[PDB]
Amino acid sequence: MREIVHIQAGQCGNQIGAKFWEVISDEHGIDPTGSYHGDSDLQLERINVYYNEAAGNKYVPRAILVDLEPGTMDSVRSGPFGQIFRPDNFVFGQSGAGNNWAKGHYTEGAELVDSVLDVVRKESESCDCLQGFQLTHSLGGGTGSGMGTLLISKIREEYPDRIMNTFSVVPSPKVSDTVVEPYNATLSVHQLVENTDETYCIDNEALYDICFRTLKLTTPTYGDLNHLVSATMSGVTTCLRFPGQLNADLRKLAVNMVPFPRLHFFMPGFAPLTSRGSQQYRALTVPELTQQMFDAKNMMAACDPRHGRYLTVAAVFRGRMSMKEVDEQMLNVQNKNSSYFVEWIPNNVKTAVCDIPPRGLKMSATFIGNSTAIQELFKRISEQFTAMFRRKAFLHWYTGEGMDEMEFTEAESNMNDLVSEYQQYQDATA
Amino acid sequence: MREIVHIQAGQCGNQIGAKFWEVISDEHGIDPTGSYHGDSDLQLERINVYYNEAAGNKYVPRAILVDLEPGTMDSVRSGPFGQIFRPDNFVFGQSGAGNNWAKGHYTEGAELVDSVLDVVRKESESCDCLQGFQLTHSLGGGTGSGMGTLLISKIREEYPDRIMNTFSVVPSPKVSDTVVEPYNATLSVHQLVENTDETYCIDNEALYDICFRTLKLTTPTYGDLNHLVSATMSGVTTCLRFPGQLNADLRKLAVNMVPFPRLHFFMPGFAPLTSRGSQQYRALTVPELTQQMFDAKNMMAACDPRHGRYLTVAAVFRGRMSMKEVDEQMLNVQNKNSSYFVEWIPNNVKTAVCDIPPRGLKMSATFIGNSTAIQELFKRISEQFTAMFRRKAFLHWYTGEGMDEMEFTEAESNMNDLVSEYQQYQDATA
Amino acid sequence: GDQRKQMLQKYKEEKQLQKLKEQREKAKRGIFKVGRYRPDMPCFLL
């Protein structure tokens, strides 16, 4: 049966992975010590998707911890839910990329990639029927981006027929957390555009907006952001673990949302999102969820879908509902916004329904969108890249590891081509 | 089914809206917490016209709170019946109009109109079959008048077939609460004559007179006047909420009361009004209600109906009564006062009966009159505007916000044409 | 007086003309809303 291997690299990857594993263990009724303490048989009928079974009812997550520095994973191990992970899955170096893509891809990554691949192969041998890989990292960092691209390259060379999902943290538009962020981002998209089956983009600014304006959170920390990202992660793959009226696994989503191989960048979203006091002021129905899906302010990437046209849309619902209500709602959305969908793809929306809702909620829904508005993000990143590349600023750090300006030119050319394709697919021609 | 969206703007609008919502909630048996604790099925049968049912047996009024300063709605929220409103409907600025029409219509209204229209859309799409819009504001203030006209214009563009109702506190004839109220009143009538379906005019001076002379109240406050206005609104919209022997909705009243599109300014009135000590000496009968309604002293507007002639008259009776008595009283009124009714319209009176009594007495009645005598108010405002406009006093305050004298001239010309039309429509010509 | 009336007349035409120009581009794409689904009336053999 279908099983998923999880990998996380860098600080952002490790933090989001820890939050994701806390969420998953809570959903399946697994205590931090690794012993099942649930109250339903459904939590165990499909537990082999994420967790292995050890001797004595103990459950070991099928996860791999990779970093070039030991600080983040030492924090993860010493913290809660640190004993579930098998200690053999903690692979680390001693140098750290230092926010250098070349260091993590060509100098430091080359030493750890063999060990990471060894752990990956050992985990996959135990799998009965592999469904694919999932990976959490950030594009703006050194080790995250470099090692993530290297690992996807190696695995794609190993298993080309499987399914690759990455949950990347693309750079924000207004405030940047690193000076060399455009360099790493461009060099990472150059590999993602050719080695990944599907990719979900995440913006810290969009997450701050959601936290401040919707959740009414005065002091949002990184824990809340990782909580939201983990909720979306769980919502994406709910159909592999619980029964439902209309099922949809990762391959179905990849078929339904990737019309051309080079356009597999999506904007995720979640619903419902309310504060601690305002949730009593609204009913819990399907149309409110549909309203929250197609809200540009609810998107988890800082791109306005109003500026472009949707290609495909995925709506994954959870809980006891009515299929007629969902279908009429999707029809109303499509007809009433006929100007925001491409004319050459009839029926832009794919629908899935799962019976088991999240713990403590009557219903929930996850939105995934393949909109051409992502071209604006790509264009902005490319513009910053070119502005910083004419003066050759900070270039001697990367060229001191083995890279040359030809790689940078190839990356910028590829990004310009991708932006051109995204723009050209907004033409009616009929 | 037939449902009404309520919007209030400015200090007066927010205060009257709070009083009106307290009145309606007491009438429908909803506690301040929002949970129904009534004793009749008819209270819940048509609760959808004003309220939305949330999860857990809770009712949220379909109201929008609009203001350019946070003090008024902060006081509303912190006061009683403040937890009943949805917090997301509170839309406030930070600057304030400062009793300036230009500042509220061009400088802050432009910034707040997008948010207010988004909230209005979110409320209206959740409706089933919208009946119309209703607005509470004044004409002598800056934010009230300016934002009211802006919102009326935008909504009329968005929904040209719905019903727009306004309850506007026109300036008093004797005492003025602002030095620049003629400017705001003229600039707001210039929009009301074109973008509003029908408008009820109420004067604070007439309300003071009613409380001091009829109710024998020694110290009337603004709460009493808001109580009177709220009673009038409930009487007007009572035919949408309870079954009636002969019933009329907003559109029927508009059809029967506006002979020409530019004459939709009415003077409301309520009966019976009596003191605590004088209730014991009077008998509640239909003729008493009829004689109290058609009383110059009882009008809620500072205009004498005897100066002009009625165009149309609407009497919405409430309670259990015999339609024979109502019809005989209407005949008696028409024949006795035949000098106050236009000849070119027979049957000047429209009658409706709602079976359920007001909360309180056994019988009650609401009076709405479309009399040509209201042209005196407009003529007086025009005189004050022209007396203040030759000297260009206070004009730079308005022209510093981008407005020009051409707008003032156009507004004055339009208002004078309206006065001429109201005047010359007193000619029988047959 | 006639010239002032002509100035007012000109101002009214300019106002309506920018109003039409403003509404021309606004109706091109549209606005994002959701609402509810409204069923169609059944067809009949009559």
Next chain:
Amino acid sequence: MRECISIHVGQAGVQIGNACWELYCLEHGIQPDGQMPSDSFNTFFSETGAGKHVPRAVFVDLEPTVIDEVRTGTYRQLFHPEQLITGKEDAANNYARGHYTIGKEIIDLVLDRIRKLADQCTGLQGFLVFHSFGGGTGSGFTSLLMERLSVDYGKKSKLEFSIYPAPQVSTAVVEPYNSILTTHTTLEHSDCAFMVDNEAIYDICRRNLDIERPTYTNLNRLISQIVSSITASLRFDGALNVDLTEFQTNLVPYPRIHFPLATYAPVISAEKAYHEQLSVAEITNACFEPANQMVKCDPRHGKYMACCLLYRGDVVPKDVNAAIATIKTKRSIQFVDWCPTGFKVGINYQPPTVVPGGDLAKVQRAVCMLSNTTAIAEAWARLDHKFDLMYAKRAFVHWYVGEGMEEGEFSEAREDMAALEKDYEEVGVDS
């Protein structure tokens, strides 16, 4: 056998229909749930299930308030749920809204229900339509429905029960527009149209029944008594039965003159019943007074063209003949010369039934009179005068024009009404 279908549109139609159906159920001993506690009423009721009777009624309105009142009341289990058809927004005293904008949305559904109900019927002979002239949905949807029915069937009879606007009593400002427009539209589609006046009913209840608080329940009960007296010939056997077609073939001499006047007798209170031994001659006499008419117009101002008499209960044909002869020899009333025989008489065995809680005593004989007279011409002329007063200044015209109605329709309706006045004045001249 022979069957009838009853249609109620608008507030007035629905309320009078509810009163009539309560009376019909009481007459035949049918419980409000539709069952029977112990067979010629197949004309109005259709057998279904295990001894359950469903009336052949269709209720149409463009607002849900009154229909929901019916759906919640005591008779909620008597009517078929699909027979009560409801819109979302009413016409709001606008003929154009009820005829062009809103009526077209549910006219197809109404026709489907009518056809489905008629297909179940083997000997259907006519339809009964209840409405009011002043109302928007009443007049507009009645005109649209009659147009569609005349197109669809043509040969079946179509009777009307309508609330003629009162000369003085009014509850609307735009009444003449709606009345003229609906009369112009329906003049060439209605076989016969009986009318009553709310003002005259008020006067009758005040003078006779000694009631000072006559809510619409009393008026609707009186109208239900009249319609029961009309349909008793179908529902019960008697010495002389009268069908629905006989009314139109005896009362309508020309296709453009089909507006008779309906009265009823005896209308007395319980205290006064004991002091009056009611007989055939005096009730026949009482049916002819202007004060007992149910339309506020003086029959003495015009001439009778055709009269229909319907007797129920203890009635001897010889007494009926003597009373009619005495009425004929009386010169206080007039008849058109070209109609030497202007009387149609029917007698039914079943006496009227008294509804408990009502305001009429128990009598063993009653009379329903329907007369086609020229005295309605002055009422028509008054309506035209009001229309002309309101049309010279184009008051309220924009409300009708904004709903798609052309401005020439008002002129066409006015010219048609003038032609009707000409016809009435020409037919009233002896030769």
Next chain:
Amino acid sequence: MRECISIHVGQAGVQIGNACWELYCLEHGIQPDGQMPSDSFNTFFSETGAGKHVPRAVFVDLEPTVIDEVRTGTYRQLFHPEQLITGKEDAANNYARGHYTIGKEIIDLVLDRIRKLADQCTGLQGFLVFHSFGGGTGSGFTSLLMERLSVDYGKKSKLEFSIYPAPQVSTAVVEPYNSILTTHTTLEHSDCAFMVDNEAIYDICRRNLDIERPTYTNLNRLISQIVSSITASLRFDGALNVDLTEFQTNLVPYPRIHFPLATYAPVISAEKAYHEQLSVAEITNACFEPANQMVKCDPRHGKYMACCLLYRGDVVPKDVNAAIATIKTKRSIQFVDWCPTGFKVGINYQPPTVVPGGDLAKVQRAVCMLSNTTAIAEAWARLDHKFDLMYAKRAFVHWYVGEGMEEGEFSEAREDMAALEKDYEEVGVDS
């Protein structure tokens, strides 16, 4: 005697089969554990062991979740463990995956199971196939399995109950590709295919059953009721019995036109059954109404080729003949001139049974209606237009190409579909 083998493939087929087999166990009085608590049902249930009846069903899917749900349900101890066949990875809405890559891995096992089940049968009459067009596993595997069966048996009839894509409602983006490919490769390997639309059944549930939350269970129950009405003639005895062969003999005029539409009557709620008498004439009339057809297409837009009527319960042949004649005289519907006789009837004594906790009322008679008409050409044209829209830019093509499909198959399917539309238009012209 005569026996039928049922095959359910994909999520839709498996769930409709769950509903069908629940209904089947209920109707014959069989407990879910296979033990009867107290015999013409040997067509569907085979006797194995001591009093245990095992249904003749095969459940196939390339994804184990729905079959695992079946294995843990109330009917766990009903199906033979070897009839429930599962794969590891589904087709993922990809026709090529379920036809060329994943289907070929278990097609041999499915055929082996079907052969083992059939060799026991002595009077095998045909196969029943439940699937959906838009699905990947559904369409791809049903095409491959139907091709294999036609190669193997050929002479035995093969029937489908597929879910036609709705004109507006959709749950997939690559739906037209799979639909066109599977109808192209299935057209020459089938005898009769009854199709339904989810949207039409949603409308039926909302309008008639007054259900505001019609989950998939209600739709599956309605489809199960239709299948049970179809197979009642095999499972019981009637005044006029129709087996499977007569369906294709009478409903299929040409080999390339075997797409009838299935309706049902009466579909009413419990509360409305009291106010309606369910006569044969009224249900026969309702079966022809466009608002009751369970495919979103207007019959009035085309002409019927052949019609099949199946009556259950209290039915008398004279009334059936009268109703059919009345339908024939009606001009609202149309028939092709080259088919003077276009009706085939069947009457069975066994009335329909009601699943407890369900939504349909208890009735003494019911009708199943199958119609072969040209109105579906519009739906075919709509599907082909969607195909053309999505194929002019090669959208989603690489997914199919990478699994072993050459690009020429799309063109071949499009030309075959155009040929079928041309056939539908050529047969729709009177001579």
